[PDB]
């Protein structure tokens, strides 16, 4: 059976502040002795497009108010790096977890922990989509929400902020460093996303998780190889799929080949009409090949 | 934008341990001096039918082994309660959160923590269905993995221990008094729960939903009355529906009754043929209205 899930959030709820410039409020992330937050939270309050240059220019160190828990940290000074701020605080985090700082590919599945005044209130899984952006499920104030995933180690890396809700209700973050992904503009705009790819990858990892519930109706007999499929994908709507040698786990486990679930993807690619798969009446590509691995067998 | 989320772990995290009789593990729950825990625990190994009230006059103490993060504790004294123990340790959890116990009914929505070993693994939403079961994702090991609530307060309500997986998938737990969910005995059996019926508070909550994002080629502008709508409810797989009162933030932010939208799940029963709502091609039993009212407004 495949839920998606998210990994427990205790360790990165208190690494989460309420970041506060003048009347504006969202949430940064506390490690160390430096709280990250985005940049929006220095954005005067206007209708025209937002300078941040000059915002950062005028801005007064006494103006920012950050908190965890209702109690202040002392700030001691101001860095924008691309989208965000680094506010260093006279107080390290004694909760900062083994981290680092990871960037996300389209295609990478991690954890939200959805904040407000820098509290969480919510923690789920999501995808990062062909056009960068996710998901989620934000109202007003979740700027700054953060997103992670847990190694095996335990080591945290932190990979996501939340930034912006575009038009169509996708939602737009950027890395620890600043980078907005897919280099949205991180303010008000009428900004339109390309569309989406379906994540190759993700659905051959999720016909892998139906064969392994004796759910094969649609296997198909013939095989497509990388190159035909990759051709086909460019074509469809669909991402190249990167490699065979990673499914050889359920490859060896069904026994089908990754180039079976190719040409089944070509078969299914209309609809089941009117069958499902694991409840699916299309193909289904929110899970990763780690998460079905994790999933069936805690590997 | 509707996203199934669990609610903060960390609370409950800092109350799961691993606990261990001979060589059978599974999860618990540290509140206070007390580690509430499936029974399986004390399980013989065997196939027959297990007598744990041979099993619990039998018990020595010092086969338990109790840990926290892989910090032992100590066993004072232990008692049986319908499906779970209650092992009372040397220590109290200095984290224990202000809690309760609550016993769900179905239709609650709550949280699981899946756990391994004492650690947890993932967390996700469910709601308990009305044969009593959730669909989870476990695999080995998940025994005593807990569900949750908190309270607008912040008082958790633990409300289920993870007891079994049925023959069809479905998973069964315990309240934390014992009582198993459904009155599914908690050993291996040929048991068999009732049949799904659709949650249809949700359902008109995810059709609010859909209208509150434009989503409306659907609406029906007939009425049908709450009691006709059970009527017919009880000869289509739907529950019925508790009250329409509940939904006036959204009936006055749609212009939509509830009785219309009770007319729509009559006209939408069967299907959308083939359009989608929300990106769903059948009606959506996953969100509750306080589910739906929270992602969209913060209330």
């Known amino acids: 059976g495949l839920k998606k899930m998210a990994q427990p959030s205790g360790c990165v ?19 160390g002795d430096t709280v990250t937050c985005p940049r929006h939270v220095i954005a005067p309050s206007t209708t025209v497009l937002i300078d941040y240059d000059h915002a950062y ?31 260093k605080v006279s107080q390290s985090n004694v909760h900062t977890p083994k981290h680092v700082f990871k960037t996300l590919k389209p295609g990478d599945s991690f954890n939200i922990l959805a904040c407000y005044e820098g509290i969480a209130s919510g923690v789920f899984g999501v995808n990062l989509r062909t056009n960068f952006t996710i998901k989620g499920s934000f109202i007003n104030g979740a700027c700054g929400s953060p997103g992670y995933n847990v190694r095996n180690d335990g080591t945290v890396e932190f990979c996501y902020l939340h930034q912006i809700e575009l038009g169509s209700g996708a939602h737009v973050g950027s890395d620890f460093t600043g980078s907005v992904y897919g280099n949205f503009d991180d303010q008000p705009s009428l900004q339109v996303e390309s569309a989406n790819l379906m994540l190759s990858d993700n659905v051959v990892a999720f016909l892998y ?40 786990i359920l490859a060896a486990k069904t026994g089908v080949s990754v180039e079976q679930l190719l040409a089944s993807i070509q078969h299914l690619h ?9 409840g699916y009446s299309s193909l289904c590509d929110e899970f990763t090949l780690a998460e079905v691995v994790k999933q069936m067998y805690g590997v």
């Open 209 to 248: 998780a139906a064969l392994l519930n004796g759910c094969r109706w649609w296997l198909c007999s013939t095989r497509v190889n990388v190159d035909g499929f990759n051709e086909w994908a460019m074509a469809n709507g669909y991402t190249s799929v990167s490699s065979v040698e990673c499914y050889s």
């Open 13 to 31: 709820e208190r690494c989460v502040v309420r970041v506060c410039y003048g009347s504006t409020v969202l949430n940064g992330v506390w490690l």
């Open 57 to 87: 220019s005028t801005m007064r160190l006494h103006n920012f108010s950050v908190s965890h828990n209702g109690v202040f940290l002392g700030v001691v000074g101001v860095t924008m790096h691309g989208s965000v701020l680094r506010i």
């Open 270 to 278: 209309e609809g089941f009409g009117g069958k499902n798969i694991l």
